[PDB]
Amino acid sequence: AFNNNPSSVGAYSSGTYRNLAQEMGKTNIQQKVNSTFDNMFGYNNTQQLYYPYTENGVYKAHYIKAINPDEGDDIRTQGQSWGMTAAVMLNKQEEFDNLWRFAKAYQKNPDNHPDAKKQGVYAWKLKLNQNGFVYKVDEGPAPDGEEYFAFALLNASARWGNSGEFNYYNDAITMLNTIKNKLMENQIIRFSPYIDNLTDPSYHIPAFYDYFANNVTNQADKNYWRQVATKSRTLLKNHFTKVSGSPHWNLPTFLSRLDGSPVIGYIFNGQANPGQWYEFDAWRVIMNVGLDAHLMGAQAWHKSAVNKALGFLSYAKTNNSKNCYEQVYSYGGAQNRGCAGEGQKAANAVALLASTNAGQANEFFNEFWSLSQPTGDYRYYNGSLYMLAMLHVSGNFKFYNNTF
Secondary structure: OOOOOOOOOOHHHHOOOOOHHHHOOOOOHHHHHHHHHHHHOOOOOOOOOEEEEEEOOEEEEEEEEEOOOOOOOEEEHHHHHHHHHHHHHOOOHHHHHHHHHHHHHHHEOOOOOOOHHHOOOEEEEEEEOOOOOEEEEEEEEOOHHHHHHHHHHHHHHHHHOOOOOOOHHHHHHHHHHHHHHHOEEOOEEOOOOOOOOOEOHHHOOHHHHHHHHOOOOOHHHHHHHHHHHHHHHHHHHHHHHHHOOOOOOOOOOOOEOOOOOEOOOOOOOOOOOOOOEEOOOOHHHHHHHHHHHHHHOOOHHHHHHHHHHHHHHHHHHHOOOOOOOEOOEEOOEEOOOOEOOHHHHHHHHHHHHHOOOHHHHHHHHHHHHOOOOOOOOOHHHHHHHHHHHHHHOOOOOOOOOOOO
16 A cells, blocks of 8 residues: 655665555566666667667767657767666666766766866767767756766765776766866756856755765765755755745746746746746656655655645646646646656656655556556657656665765
8 A cells, every 4th residue: 555654764764665666556566677677778779768879880888869859869968867877776787887988978078178167067968970970069067967977976886886997986076076066056956057046946856965965075075965955955845835826836847046936937048948837857856856755754845745746737637638637837727738748657656755645646656657668759758757767666766875
């Protein structure tokens, strides 16, 4: 049965990881987790997201391919970092190393880049040119990429040690330094080095910062990351307060001010969507809230955030001609951007780790569990989230501490 009374003590502290699929009475859970990884990281061109990169017939590294039928396939730091995270959780070292080799070689902007703001950050969009060779389309970062890179590398160090191809630990501390020095404003993760008073709620994963704090050696840095964790929970608490009821109707948004206020409309040249949209990025917010509740303990705010958000989506489904909740909402209004796909359902399943409604949990979890693994042209985002969710709901997303 679903545990609708999630502990205020986190798995990180207790060592007790929930198996949500087991609570929900599912069988062959680990087999399904294993097959999900195998298909995503197998040469099947079906579920596959993990692809080798070669230069003049010489093998170099691997990348997560952001398949894009409209604008051409590209390569993203989010997908790369999520892929490494999945690999370390399942003890898949070659897959991890191949992805990390690619990121370090090809995504990393040089430390001596003429623009100080780009030094050591990871270029969010790469492509292969007409001759098949990799190049940077956009040198600007997507900062939750660096966050997951640091997280994955710290875990890789803890599981595998640092005497092989990579000193994972040194790579992780370097990544943490880059986040601190390039991607933060007053201990809140940035949307951009070039814009102040701006964050993306989906970049907030408070438990990661607590894990960072426990894996750095010096006192100042330990305190720094603990403060980032607290300020992140505050940001999310404030955001959820601000999106409660009218006019945002309980869904978190794409962009936020540092006080948690949703950004209204457009604010910068190049902006993909209005700030107040619950869209593709925003899907991840309650997933992160679920993560934080599981790993660091469920508090009143976690439960309220998820309960109200899932509450809205259930309501929105009843008022939809297609009997689905949709991928994009603004001010509680459907934006006609399609029925929820696998990624959104996946994110919402992970959110259940903070849910206190067994009925809600049954509906949202079964809708996720009944899905086939993403295939086809939209599988990059759907499939990446599906993989992460499969780990989260099977008790496989764990924090591996380094020893000092």
